[PDB]
Write a protein that binds this ligand. Structure first.
Ligand SMILES: [Ca+2]
Ligand SMILES: [Ca+2]
Lengths: 330, 331
């Protein structure tokens, strides 16, 4: 058996329960979770308002993890007992979440934890790094020298998208709110107050031409703002492009737009190997000091998960997360 | 709009003055124009990157105590109006912006009107130590009128305020201190005890050898062991620095009790926030009746001399150690 937090019904509390401990099937390893990375989507799932996540209740939530391999299933040779690992492993599509002491994970989803990171630090980068990578690299194939605008540079996907873009040689700019402008500047990017109009910051920073690549990490009206900021023949990508939008800007500018939906891999069981690969890329960036997760200093035990999400969403009067929130399971 | 703030960029790095975005008050918060920033030894431990319990990684703006004026109020706030002078323990830990800044957006619950009789400097050094002293003496020990109370380190930060709280609540107060502070402790109205004397000796002279009903250790380490030695049978010992390993035998022999004090939890976990402003209201009530006066080192330091301010707090680089607490004048 093991201890895990279960959300029994919509909007219900994170109930600590003693449950049967998962056993690794062939191709899987058993991970003793030390840190669980939170994400806003978990809150939507908890509230039963995340149809795209296909994670009906009751269920153990949490998508990212960082821990140690304690058992290896048959047909596995990529990891050994004692190895520190991390990755985006479940919490969606019926997959057991990471708000647990243990999880049986397909080895392809894991990568060794970067030696330079604590478990907390490593636990918050899987989903957002993969989300940023899929958009910047897989879809937009960002090139050295291109001008890149990250909408919401202080956010989960934003701060990692900025660092990936910089590492790949792009000239990076990022819109952020007051409290995050200094953070973005320190990363090496050019900060832009998010209250400004695209026509204005594009004028100041791109001679009014627009940006080669715009990564919308906020969605809604921000995606429209992104269409406005993109250069002719440019590319716009979004990881929250679920709404309806006027497309005229893309035609007038003979531009391109791509959608990003990282969850597909776990929901449909396809391209699992690509996850471990992307995480390996992240590790390389950490080793060379070009990637550092933004981790809120606050700690939360497996018994304080509710408070963890209050922080993630800045609800019930707790300051909003400044960087991401990690739960210390062990 | 922007503001000037001192930022510690890396472990042991200098206090770097920077022009940064001025904070904006969210619902439930008020924007405080900081006039005085109160220092504390912990800030230096955080600066050196050796304060894990503080959860304040760098780069960051340090400083936990403040005293200033409300210049803007966020939505849903009715406890304070623009222009109100306030003071409180507001940040410097758990990722919260420190007070070495011209402004700070603070949850109204953490604030209390500044005592009218105190200058901004005086009020700025009161929050943390008062709250620390109060949680031990009242919340944990519930000091009662007539009880004998021994404050270990009466001239120190928590010590001098603990003495005054205990006296105000009717207790017979005694305090151990080093030479230079013995006179100060006597002045407060407590019976001074040279810190070099043994517990069995001062307990004999002042409690007929019975010991004290309540002992507050503000120094920790060996001083906590000495506290276990000075406590009366069935007595209570509290400490705000009880992190080490100690022999507990004395507590069984004396069928006594011990309680720990850790004020930071409130700010690190965001629970019991309202209790902070409430305790500071208690402090204001004591100042008002002339029963509480913070010990403030006469030396002054501008936002540009923070490094020197802490040299004083720690008595580093030849500078004389603080005699009372050190306050930074921001505005
Ligand atoms: Ca996030
Ligand atoms: Ca002090």
């Amino acid at each position: 058996t093991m201890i895990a937090a279960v959300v029994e019904e919509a909007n219900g509390p994170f109930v600590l329960r003693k449950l049967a401990r998962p056993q690794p099937a062939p191709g899987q390893v058993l991970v003793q979770i030390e840190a669980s990375g939170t994400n806003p989507l978990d809150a939507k799932i908890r509230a039963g308002e995340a149809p795209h996540a296909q994670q009906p209740l009751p269920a153990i939530l949490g998508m990212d993890l960082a821990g140690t391999v304690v058992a290896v299933g048959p047909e596995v040779d990529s990891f050994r007992v004692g190895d520190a690992v991390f990755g985006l492993t479940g919490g969606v599509g019926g997959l057991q979440g990471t708000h647990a002491q243990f999880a049986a994970v397909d080895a392809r989803l894991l990568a060794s934890k970067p030696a330079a990171l604590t478990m907390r630090q490593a636990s918050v980068l899987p989903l957002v790094f993969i989300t940023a990578w899929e958009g910047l690299v897989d879809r937009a194939q960002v090139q050295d020298g291109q001008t890149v605008l990250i909408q919401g540079g202080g956010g989960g996907v934003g701060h990692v998208a900025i660092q990936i873009a910089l590492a790949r040689g792009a000239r990076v700019f990022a819109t952020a709110r007051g409290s995050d402008l200094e953070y973005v500047r320190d990363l090496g990017a050019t900060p832009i107050d998010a209250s400004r109009e695209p026509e204005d910051y594009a004028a100041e920073h791109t001679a009014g031409q627009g940006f080669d690549l715009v990564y919308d990490t906020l969605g809604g009206p921000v995606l429209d703002a992104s269409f406005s900021a993109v250069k002719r023949f440019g590319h716009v990508v979004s990881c929250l492009g679920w709404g309806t939008h006027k497309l005229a800007p893309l035609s007038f500018k003979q531009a391109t737009y791509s959608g990003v939906f990282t969850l597909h891999t776990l929901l449909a069981n396809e391209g699992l190997a690509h996850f471990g690969e992307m995480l390996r890329e992240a590790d390389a960036l950490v080793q060379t000091g070009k990637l550092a997760p933004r981790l809120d200093p606050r700690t939360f035990s497996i018994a304080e998960i509710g408070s963890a999400y209050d922080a993630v969403l800045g609800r019930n009067d707790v300051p909003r997360q400044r960087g991401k929130i990690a739960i210390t399971v062990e």
